[PDB]
Design an enzyme around this catalytic site. Structure first.
Site, PDB file in Angstrom:
ATOM      1  N   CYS A 141       0.830  -1.197   0.000  1.00  0.00           N
ATOM      2  CA  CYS A 141       0.000   0.000   0.000  1.00  0.00           C
ATOM      3  C   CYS A 141       0.866   1.250   0.000  1.00  0.00           C
ATOM      4  O   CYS A 141       1.999   1.227   0.473  1.00  0.00           O
ATOM      5  CB  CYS A 141      -0.936   0.002   1.207  1.00  0.00           C
ATOM      6  N   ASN A 177      -5.298   7.606   0.223  1.00  0.00           N
ATOM      7  CA  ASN A 177      -4.763   6.590   1.117  1.00  0.00           C
ATOM      8  C   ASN A 177      -5.592   6.588   2.389  1.00  0.00           C
ATOM      9  O   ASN A 177      -5.935   7.653   2.908  1.00  0.00           O
ATOM     10  CB  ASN A 177      -3.291   6.846   1.444  1.00  0.00           C
ATOM     11  N   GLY A 178      -5.908   5.402   2.885  1.00  0.00           N
ATOM     12  CA  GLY A 178      -6.723   5.266   4.071  1.00  0.00           C
ATOM     13  C   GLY A 178      -8.187   5.058   3.744  1.00  0.00           C
ATOM     14  O   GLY A 178      -8.568   4.677   2.635  1.00  0.00           O
ATOM     15  N   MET A 229     -19.141  -2.992  36.183  1.00  0.00           N
ATOM     16  CA  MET A 229     -19.298  -4.403  35.857  1.00  0.00           C
ATOM     17  C   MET A 229     -20.145  -4.522  34.602  1.00  0.00           C
ATOM     18  O   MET A 229     -21.088  -3.751  34.403  1.00  0.00           O
ATOM     19  CB  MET A 229     -19.939  -5.188  37.007  1.00  0.00           C
ATOM     20  N   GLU A 235      -3.594  -6.096  31.086  1.00  0.00           N
ATOM     21  CA  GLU A 235      -2.938  -4.802  30.963  1.00  0.00           C
ATOM     22  C   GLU A 235      -2.441  -4.332  32.325  1.00  0.00           C
ATOM     23  O   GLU A 235      -3.105  -4.518  33.347  1.00  0.00           O
ATOM     24  CB  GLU A 235      -3.906  -3.779  30.360  1.00  0.00           C
ATOM     25  N   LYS A 275     -16.298  -1.703  27.052  1.00  0.00           N
ATOM     26  CA  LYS A 275     -16.195  -0.348  26.513  1.00  0.00           C
ATOM     27  C   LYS A 275     -15.476  -0.397  25.171  1.00  0.00           C
ATOM     28  O   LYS A 275     -14.237  -0.372  25.117  1.00  0.00           O
ATOM     29  CB  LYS A 275     -15.470   0.576  27.488  1.00  0.00           C
TER      30      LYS A 275
HETATM   31  C1  LIG Z   1     -12.704  -6.640  36.734  1.00  0.00           C
HETATM   32  C2  LIG Z   1     -12.353  -6.792  35.286  1.00  0.00           C
HETATM   33  C3  LIG Z   1     -11.162  -6.265  34.809  1.00  0.00           C
HETATM   34  C4  LIG Z   1     -10.830  -6.404  33.469  1.00  0.00           C
HETATM   35  N1  LIG Z   1      -9.646  -5.878  33.004  1.00  0.00           N
HETATM   36  C5  LIG Z   1      -9.316  -6.013  31.674  1.00  0.00           C
HETATM   37  C6  LIG Z   1      -8.126  -5.485  31.200  1.00  0.00           C
HETATM   38  O1  LIG Z   1      -7.369  -4.899  31.968  1.00  0.00           O
HETATM   39  N2  LIG Z   1      -7.795  -5.621  29.870  1.00  0.00           N
HETATM   40  C7  LIG Z   1      -8.649  -6.280  29.011  1.00  0.00           C
HETATM   41  O2  LIG Z   1      -8.350  -6.398  27.826  1.00  0.00           O
HETATM   42  N3  LIG Z   1      -9.837  -6.806  29.476  1.00  0.00           N
HETATM   43  C8  LIG Z   1     -10.172  -6.674  30.805  1.00  0.00           C
HETATM   44  N4  LIG Z   1     -11.354  -7.201  31.271  1.00  0.00           N
HETATM   45  C9  LIG Z   1     -12.272  -7.907  30.323  1.00  0.00           C
HETATM   46  C10 LIG Z   1     -11.898  -9.377  30.239  1.00  0.00           C
HETATM   47  O3  LIG Z   1     -10.644  -9.504  29.610  1.00  0.00           O
HETATM   48  C11 LIG Z   1     -12.947 -10.139  29.444  1.00  0.00           C
HETATM   49  O4  LIG Z   1     -13.091  -9.548  28.174  1.00  0.00           O
HETATM   50  C12 LIG Z   1     -14.283 -10.112  30.169  1.00  0.00           C
HETATM   51  O5  LIG Z   1     -14.066 -10.225  31.557  1.00  0.00           O
HETATM   52  C13 LIG Z   1     -15.163 -11.263  29.711  1.00  0.00           C
HETATM   53  O6  LIG Z   1     -16.361 -11.235  30.447  1.00  0.00           O
HETATM   54  P1  LIG Z   1     -16.991 -12.603  31.001  1.00  0.00           P
HETATM   55  O7  LIG Z   1     -16.216 -12.983  32.236  1.00  0.00           O
HETATM   56  O8  LIG Z   1     -18.447 -12.398  31.333  1.00  0.00           O
HETATM   57  O9  LIG Z   1     -16.852 -13.697  29.973  1.00  0.00           O
HETATM   58  C14 LIG Z   1     -11.690  -7.068  32.603  1.00  0.00           C
HETATM   59  C15 LIG Z   1     -12.885  -7.594  33.080  1.00  0.00           C
HETATM   60  C16 LIG Z   1     -13.215  -7.456  34.422  1.00  0.00           C
HETATM   61  C17 LIG Z   1     -14.502  -8.025  34.939  1.00  0.00           C
HETATM   62  S1  F3S Z   2     -17.420  -7.724  45.820  1.00  0.00           S
HETATM   63 FE1  F3S Z   2     -16.394  -8.793  44.165  1.00  0.00          FE
HETATM   64  S2  F3S Z   2     -17.753  -8.971  42.336  1.00  0.00           S
HETATM   65 FE2  F3S Z   2     -16.653  -7.009  42.152  1.00  0.00          FE
HETATM   66  S3  F3S Z   2     -17.707  -5.219  43.050  1.00  0.00           S
HETATM   67 FE3  F3S Z   2     -16.366  -6.124  44.678  1.00  0.00          FE
HETATM   68  S4  F3S Z   2     -14.784  -7.302  43.486  1.00  0.00           S
END
Ligand SMILES: Cc1cc2nc3c(=O)[nH]c(=O)nc-3n(C[C@H](O)[C@H](O)[C@H](O)COP(=O)(O)O)c2cc1C
Ligand code: F3S
Lengths: 153, 1472, 116
Positions: free
Chosen positions: B1, B231-232, B479, B886, B937
């Site tokens: 490219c 490009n792009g 969550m 991460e 996200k």
């Molecule tokens: C508390 C928590 C922290 C997480 N931290 C990361 C992260 O630092 N980097 C990342 O790529 N995904 C992170 N995830 C997402 C997980 O890698 C994964 O995509 C997700 O937990 C899957 O959800 P499930 O357990 O319902 O299958 C995190 C998820 C949770 C619940």
């Molecule tokens: S109680 Fe446990 S499920 Fe998450 S909000 Fe606190 S780490």
């Protein structure tokens, strides 16, 4: 300029300092305040950047530096130049460089016009006495050879 | 490219131009599409001037006379398969050319040689012919071009009339000729030997090669297009076509005449975005405008709100913004009419483009400064291009025009300052607004009635509404929400819950909104749309708004401003209308609006004030969709505007959904009334009403800005009515009859169900007495609301079942999970076979299956070290693969302990932040993973609260203690597919043992990006779902983004198996995987590996508080304090038994199913059947658009190829073969080589070997030195360990010093180059991205986005560009020269020394978290003295020695920039 | 420490053998047989009297304060057969490196070249 690159030799600087002279480097004069007998010298300090890709530092002026030195008798030693030779000898065909010094060939040390040769300090510029003697001997050899040839032909 | 252009200044033809063009084109195979076949290409083209003498010679040979006027050549792609079409095609072209009297000179067939292209690209090869025609009327040149363009358009339309596919016209003119095809770039001169004649000479040429994302080629889809290259990709194309169809109705100009009628469909169908841009560009330039004019109009310059630019420039910017909507996104445009040659950028400067000037008056530009071989001393300028800038070459007068010269000369056309004052603003109307007629709010009873009418609970009035109006920012959830989708729930939900938001993967990058506020604008223009070809002042008489959302008083002021031009539409329909009353209401409003527009009205106000006991409120979304699509279809939207008054807008998502449909303004008056009535009740404190209102408005604007930046677009003006969303669970007919264009995978309810739901809610809200707003279950678990994913019984059952270590209780758990009401899609499916079961000990062993499970990544910041280590050891002891997440990893956990446990991970994450990647960190694992977009996200940065980062995490991430550290929403290294391929190549070079994995998020259109990333030498595509958790994210993103992983996976599988690439990768999914049924269904769908995630946390002791983002987790998991960490209860044996039970369950399920192993059920998707929910819902959900699959054939449906796909090695391999003593005895070495721009990531494998032998800091600096001569390659010296010193005599391309971890890079121009070492670029963009330590000494100027994510590097540069030192976290950056704009965006660590000259730095600095001062304490003077001393003694520069020579007074010209968060945390403070 | 390998890579065997021991021939990737030096052929390398200090005396196991001169012949190669014998010995003491032979240009050197 700076002391390191004074066009003269270093022994002279040390001797002049020993005798009691006072040196002020990196300056240039601009005015001489006075009515009939000069009373002061208005001069400005200068700055020198780093050398170029050739080896010749470029000067500049300071926009805030101005000073005045006590003056009673000013003696200029700016330099020297060669005269205007063509009209001086009624020979306006003398090939001269733009700087005032005359041209001369490298091999025989003979100028444009025949018979007349030219060598010494007038060809080079503000050279030394050793170069003068060198050019003198070369011109002597050239004169001898050319005169022998001319007598022969 | 790549794309590049060569131009000559004087303006005379010469063969050298074409020669250099071909030579440059022949050095792009490194960025291309390297594959295994060896002959297939992806599209390449050149565009040059017509060699009139050659065709004159040709027609002289034929037998006619040699004419005087310039000939005209036209290249056509004719059908080849059926000869019965060639006759008709020749017929059409001849009968439409002879329509004016032009003398046809003849036909010609270009010589070719099909022995060099591949086979898949050959079965689609068309016939290529050329027509030579002449002029006989002696017409002028401009009229000649106009007539040729009209002829081409008419021929295209006529050929469209006969429905004869496979017909195209490359270029039809007398100034330009295009040679483009579907072959490899290098072989071009062997496919078209015509270019080897000694007469093809020109004065300009443009070359391009594109990267095919899919493997099915199409000849007419290869750049350069008709008079444009690109490009792009453009972020917003689906939103520009609608506005173009709108402007189709008011375009006409006497430069065309009657033939204008044959130019109505300006944009065809099937052409790529670049093609559409090309066609509208050609139309806009065929009227009389110049190339820079139409360029400035199409892709405007970002309006910097500073007086640092000339005012005429600001007026021109205002005009160009007002006349036409922008087309933002990655673009390095190279346009050229018959007269000008223009190169330009986009608003943000996303893709690089660098040029150079020779001594011969020749300018050469492209994407790499080494593609052409020129004498190093015969150059005069090595320049770059910033955002919005442009360069121009005027061939008619032979003049170069730089940025400012061109902008001034173009502002010298018309008085742009005198017209920007012809408009009318809004501030003057709101300050002099009538403080009379204020409305009296309703009584509280009717207010609660109307609120219940929309199903609006009370928890929103404190959870998602109170924090917004209190401080001025959105809410945050902690969550992943697992509530059922909108179409499955029975309780009435807002209709917006059926529209998910769109975002962009690695194809187009996101953009940060918290730091790039200068580039985003939310202006709105009422009375704006007009004729696009006119040039007068009537176009700039209009109303300007600073925001689309407005309050009540402002709305009344604007309505009175509109005078007697307003129109109102009833947004309510009778409750007793009948079963089909909604259709009647929609038809009534549709005819009423179309009746009111023609009568003379100009502003349609759509309000819902008519709501009463007998009239229910029509969903404003459907009303807006219907009216906008009707006004578009009826050529009327240009005449009017569309203001809407909603009644349920409270969040930041509803307004975005409404604006994405086509509305202009929104005034939610119920929200303001609720805010007022909740403020007069005294629960906020002692804050004034208008102050809270202002904070609320600012919060809404910031939310809309974030939701616009998530996709990648920059301006709201090009987003209004773009249809950039995703529909789920609605009927195709409805979504395509009342919404412009949105993809609907599965159908759903139509109109009758919505009518039933709305009538039900209206009845239960109005006809009875409600006194108290219910709590409602929508965010956290409550018994009054709907269902949830993690209930109390389920979690307690799982915890007891894992503690008692019993299997029957786990069976009870699974049976409870299964017998639940239908909540997710994967429940509706049912397994079905034709076999008889076998004994349970005939299936594979327990380990044979347990060797397929993994756990997804989790951040070290949002978890505890104890829990992280417990998960790691639990996943390592079983034999599965663990994670690191991460946030790096503690080095001390790399080797096993005395108890026999390996406390190191198995998968390493390289996310957008790169917070812990070092030399050693990338060499303590077996797999790599590029965290593109997280599950919860999408297109957002990794969030982490400020007070959670203790000293531990702050010293582990090379950060400052206690500060909100947010990852960049973009990745700064993945801007297009070639850049991702480059990054994968680097990550595979640094570690020759591991493999690299990519993580994607399920959404529509993922098939193209899947087929693209598969060709980028990846081998694992991990598809995440939208039901995954996170650490901290806004609730709107979790609730209104992403799709279930089923659709994404079933799409990726089909697209990969269709293109015969399925046998080259592995597919793994996660998200909600709880019991064995879900695992076996995922295995049936096409996945191979599996991730568990949050369920594992439940096995540790998490009690589902969903309050992790406050650091008070009761079970001590997401805790960072001291007293709360001691509450930990988990044990690795819990995870052991959990995984063992899951394995046994899936073993028994497959046993009862009948088969013997998992490798035979993967892809046999005919074993699933769809059943109904019950005889009461009456929906028509059809999952069939997934149940289909493609029959593979020979290659299997799984990864049949063990071991990664290796990559071609650069010279560094040969380097290893020479440096044996450094590995066998440990002695210094000094090497030297000749480099080219086709050597990617040099010196990386040597760094790997060094860090494998000794360590991060086991060698003394300057141990081994490597001197390269000439232009280097891309990403020089990636991840260098201390001791290695790479010196260059020349210049680097880009990504130089990326991920530095101790190297010492020195770049300098050659000794024989007469160039000022401080006024010419010597490096590229994103220098030192995410470095960790090491010194860097440049001897030129840098590109844009310099020194981003820097952590411990010490760099010295004599230049900078836009967004320099963005998010600098630590280190030092000495900068000697003018900087660009937006300096030190959000910097929170390190120090910067800037050397201003005209004393204008305070005009460019983004003073947010940094302060700038003069050098005060002598310690910093000595520090800077040492640094510049080392720089001048290492590179022997001239400007450095000059500054050092006049050092006495030059220190007063220095500025020092230091962050505000470290003013009192330094040993030597800043001020005395 | 600085990674400087002051060791040499090619060891010589002159006509004097002033430092040739067992190990000194086991620290090189190439041997050398100095038959006739370039400028002064058919003669032994000299060393003045006042240059031999104690260090070089311990290096050559000689006595300080005396002029060193090696015999012009090599005292081991009196014909081609003895040259082959010495090459055999040198290849057997060092089973890793190669050997070499240094000569001086003159007329008829082709025959001795073919011999060696
Ligand atoms: C508390 C928590 C922290 C997480 N931290 C990361 C992260 O630092 N980097 C990342 O790529 N995904 C992170 N995830 C997402 C997980 O890698 C994964 O995509 C997700 O937990 C899957 O959800 P499930 O357990 O319902 O299958 C995190 C998820 C949770 C619940
Ligand atoms: S109680 Fe446990 S499920 Fe998450 S909000 Fe606190 S780490």
């Amino acid at each position: 300029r700076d002391r390191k690159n004074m066009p003269g030799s270093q022994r002279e600087v040390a001797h002049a300092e020993e005798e009691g002279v006072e040196f002020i480097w990196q300056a240039a004069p601009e005015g001489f305040t006075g009515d009939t007998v000069v009373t002061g010298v208005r001069a400005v300090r200068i700055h020198l950047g780093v050398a170029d890709a050739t080896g010749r530092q470029t000067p500049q002026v300071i926009e805030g530096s101005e000073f005045t030195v006590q003056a009673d008798l000013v003696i200029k030693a700016l330099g020297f130049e060669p005269e205007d030779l063509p009209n001086a000898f009624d020979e306006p065909e003398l090939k001269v460089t733009r700087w005032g010094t005359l041209l001369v060939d490298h091999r025989t040390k003979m100028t444009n016009m025949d018979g007349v040769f030219a060598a010494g300090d007038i060809v080079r510029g503000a050279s030394l006495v050793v170069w003068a003697i060198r050019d003198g001997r070369d011109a002597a050899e050239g004169i001898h050879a050319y005169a022998k040839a001319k007598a022969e032909a | 490219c790549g794309v590049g252009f060569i131009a000559a200044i004087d303006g005379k033809p010469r063969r050298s131009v074409v020669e250099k063009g071909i030579e440059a084109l022949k050095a792009v195979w490194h960025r291309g599409a390297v594959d295994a076949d060896g002959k297939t290409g992806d599209g390449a083209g050149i565009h040059v001037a017509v060699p009139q003498k050659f065709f004159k010679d040709h027609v002289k040979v034929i037998g006619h006379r040699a004419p005087d006027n310039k000939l005209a050549v036209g290249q056509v792609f004719l059908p080849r398969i059926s000869l019965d079409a060639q006759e008709a095609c020749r017929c059409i072209v001849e009968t439409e050319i002879l329509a004016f009297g032009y003398y046809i000179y003849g036909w010609r067939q270009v010589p070719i040689n099909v022995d060099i292209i591949g086979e898949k690209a050959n079965a689609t090869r068309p016939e290529i012919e050329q027509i030579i025609v002449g002029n006989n009327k002696g017409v002028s040149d401009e009229q000649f071009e106009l007539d040729l363009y009209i002829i081409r358009r008419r021929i295209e339309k006529a050929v469209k009339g006969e429905q004869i596919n496979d017909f195209y016209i490359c270029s039809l003119s007398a100034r330009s000729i295009i040679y483009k095809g579907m072959f490899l770039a290098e072989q071009l001169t062997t496919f078209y030997p015509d270019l080897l004649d000694e007469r093809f000479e020109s004065d300009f040429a443009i070359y391009h090669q594109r990267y095919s994302t899919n493997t099915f080629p199409t000849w007419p889809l290869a750049q350069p297009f008709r008079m444009l290259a690109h490009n792009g990709e453009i972020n917003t194309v689906k939103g520009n076509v609608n506005w173009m169809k709108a402007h189709e109705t008011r375009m006409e100009h006497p430069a065309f005449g009657t033939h204008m009628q044959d130019l109505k469909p300006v944009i065809g169908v099937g052409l790529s975005d670049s093609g559409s841009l090309d066609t509208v560009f050609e139309v806009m330039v065929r009227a009389g405008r110049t190339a820079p004019m139409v360029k400035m109009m199409l892709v405007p310059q970002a309006l910097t709100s500073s007086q640092t630019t000339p005012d005429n420039h600001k007026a021109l910017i205002q005009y160009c913004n007002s006349v036409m909507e922008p087309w933002d996104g990655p673009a390095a445009l190279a346009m050229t009419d018959g007269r000008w040659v223009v190169g330009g950028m986009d608003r943000n400067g996303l893709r690089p483009m660098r040029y150079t000037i020779t001594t011969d008056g020749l300018i050469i530009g492209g994407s790499e400064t080494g593609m052409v071989k020129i004498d190093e001393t015969q150059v005069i300028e090595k320049g770059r291009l910033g955002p919005g800038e442009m360069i121009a070459v005027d061939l008619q007068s032979g003049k170069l025009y730089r940025d400012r010269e061109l902008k001034d000369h173009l502002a010298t056309l018309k008085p742009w300052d005198k017209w920007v004052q012809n408009t009318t603003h809004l501030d003057e109307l709101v300050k002099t607004a009538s403080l009379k007629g204020e409305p009296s709010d309703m009584d509280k009873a009717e207010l609660r009635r109307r609120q219940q009418a929309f199903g609006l609970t009370m928890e929103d009035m404190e959870l998602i509404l109170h924090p917004m109006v209190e401080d001025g920012k959105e809410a945050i959830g902690s969550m992943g929400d697992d509530s059922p989708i909108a179409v499955l729930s029975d309780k009435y939900r807002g209709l917006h819950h059926f529209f998910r938001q769109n975002f962009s993967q690695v194809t187009n990058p996101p953009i940060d909104s918290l730091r790039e506020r200068r580039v985003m604008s939310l202006k709105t223009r009422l009375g704006n749309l007009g004729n696009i070809l006119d040039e007068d002042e009537t176009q700039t008489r209009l109303l300007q708004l600073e925001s689309p959302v407005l309050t009540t008083a402002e709305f009344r002021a604007m309505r009175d401003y509109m005078g007697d031009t307003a129109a109102e539409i009833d947004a309510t329909f009778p409750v007793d209308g009948g079963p089909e009353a909604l259709r009647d209401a929609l038809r009534r409003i549709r005819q009423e609006t179309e009746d009111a527009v023609r009568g003379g009205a100009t502003h349609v106000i759509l309000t819902d004030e008519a709501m009463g006991p007998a009239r229910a409120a029509i969903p404003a979304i459907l009303a807006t969709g219907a009216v906008h699509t009707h006004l578009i279809r009826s050529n009327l939207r240009t005449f009017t505007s569309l203001n809407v008054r909603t009644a349920e807008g409270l969040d930041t998502h509803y307004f975005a959904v409404l604006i994405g449909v086509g509305a202009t303004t929104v005034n939610a008056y119920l929200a303001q009334e609720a805010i007022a009535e909740r403020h007069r009740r005294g629960l906020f404190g002692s804050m004034p009403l208008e102050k809270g209102m202002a904070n609320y408005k600012k919060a809404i604007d910031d939310g809309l800005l974030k939701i616009m930046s998530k996709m990648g677009i920059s301006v709201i003006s090009s987003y209004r009515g773009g249809g950039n969303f995703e529909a789920i669970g609605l009927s195709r007919a409805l979504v395509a009859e009342h919404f412009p264009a949105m993809v609907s995978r599965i159908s759903g309810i139509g109109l009758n169900g919505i009518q039933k739901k709305v009538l039900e809610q209206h009845a239960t809200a109005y006809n009875e007495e409600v006194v108290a707003l219910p709590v409602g279950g929508f965010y956290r678990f409550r018994k009054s609301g709907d269902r949830h994913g993690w209930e109390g019984g389920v979690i307690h059952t799982l915890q007891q079942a894992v503690t008692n270590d019993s299997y029957t209780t786990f069976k009870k758990y699974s049976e409870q999970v299964n017998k639940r009401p239908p909540m997710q899609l994967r429940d509706l499916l049912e397994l079905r076979s034709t076999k008889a079961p076998v004994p349970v000990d005939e299936v594979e062993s327990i380990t044979a299956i347990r060797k397929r499970f993994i756990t997804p990544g989790m951040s070290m910041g949002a978890l505890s070290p104890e829990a992280h280590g417990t998960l790691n050891v639990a996943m390592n002891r079983i034999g599965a693969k663990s994670d690191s997440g991460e946030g790096g990893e503690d080095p001390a956990r790399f080797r096993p302990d005395k108890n026999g446990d390996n406390w190191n991970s198995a998968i390493k994450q390289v996310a957008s932040g790169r917070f812990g990647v070092t030399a050693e960190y990338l060499n303590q694992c077996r797999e790599l993973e590029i965290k593109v977009a997280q599950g919860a996200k999408p297109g957002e940065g990794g969030q982490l609260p400020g007070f959670k980062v203790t000293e531990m995490i702050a010293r582990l991430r090379h950060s400052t203690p206690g500060v909100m550290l947010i990852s960049p929403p973009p990745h700064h290294d993945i801007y297009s597919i070639e850049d991702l391929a480059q990054l994968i190549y680097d990550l595979k070079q640094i570690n020759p043992d591991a493999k690299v994995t990519v993580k994607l998020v399920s959404r529509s259109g993922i098939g193209t990006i899947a087929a693209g990333v598969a060709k980028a030498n990846a081998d694992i595509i991990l598809i995440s779902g939208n039901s995954g958790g996170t650490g901290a994210s806004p609730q709107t993103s979790i609730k209104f983004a992403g799709l279930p992983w089923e659709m994404g996976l079933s799409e990726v599988h089909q697209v990969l198996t269709l293109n015969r690439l399925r046998h080259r990768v592995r597919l793994r999914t996660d998200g909600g995987l709880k019991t064995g049924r879900d695992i076996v269904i995922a295995a049936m769908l096409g996945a191979e590996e599996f991730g568990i995630g949050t369920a594992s946390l439940i096995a540790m002791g998490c009690i589902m508080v969903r309050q992790c983002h406050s650091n008070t987790c009761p079970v001590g998991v997401c805790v960072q304090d001291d007293k709360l960490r001691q509450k930990f209860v988990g044990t690795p044996e819990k995870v052991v038994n959990l995984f063992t039970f899951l394995a046994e369950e899936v073993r028994e399920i497959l046993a009862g199913l009948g088969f013997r192993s998992l490798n035979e059920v993967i892809g046999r998707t005919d074993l699933l059947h769809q059943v109904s929910r019950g005889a009461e819902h009456l929906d028509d959900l059809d999952l069939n658009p997934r149940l289909a699959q493609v029959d593979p054939g020979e290659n299997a449906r799984y990864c049949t190829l063990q071991g990664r796909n290796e990559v071609p090695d650069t010279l560094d391999a040969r380097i290893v073969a020479d440096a044996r003593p450094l590995f066998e005895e440990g002695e210094k070495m000094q090497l030297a080589y000749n480099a080219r721009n086709t050597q990617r990531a040099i010196g990386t494998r040597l760094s790997s070997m060094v860090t494998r032998k000794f360590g991060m800091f086991g060698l003394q600096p300057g141990h081994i030195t490597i001197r390269l001569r000439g232009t280097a390659g891309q990403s020089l010296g990636a991840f260098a360990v201390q001791g290695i010193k790479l010196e260059v005599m020349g210049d680097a391309n880009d990504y130089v010093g990326k991920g530095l971890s101790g190297g010492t890079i020195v770049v300098r121009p050659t000794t024989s180059s007469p160039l000022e070492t401080n006024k010419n670029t010597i490096i590229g963009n994103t220098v030192l991205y995410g470095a960790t330590a090491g010194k860097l000494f440049a001897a030129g100027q840098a590109g844009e986005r310099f020194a981003v994510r820097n952590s411990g590097a010490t760099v010295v540069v004599e230049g900078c560009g836009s967004n320099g030192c963005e998010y600098m976290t630590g280190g030092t950056a000495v900068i000697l020269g003018r900087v660009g704009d937006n300096f030190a965006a959000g910097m929170t660590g390190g120090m910067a020394y800037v050397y201003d000259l005209d004393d204008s730095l305070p005009l460019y600095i983004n003073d947010e978290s940094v302060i700038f001062q003069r050098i005060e304490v002598g310690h910093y003077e000595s520090q800077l003295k040492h640094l510049i001393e080392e720089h001048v003694t290492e590179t022997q520069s001239r400007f450095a020695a000059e500054i050092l020579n006049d050092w006495a007074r030059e220190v007063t010209k220095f500025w020092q920039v230091v962050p505000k968060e470290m003013l009192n945390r330094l040993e030597v403070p800043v001020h005395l």
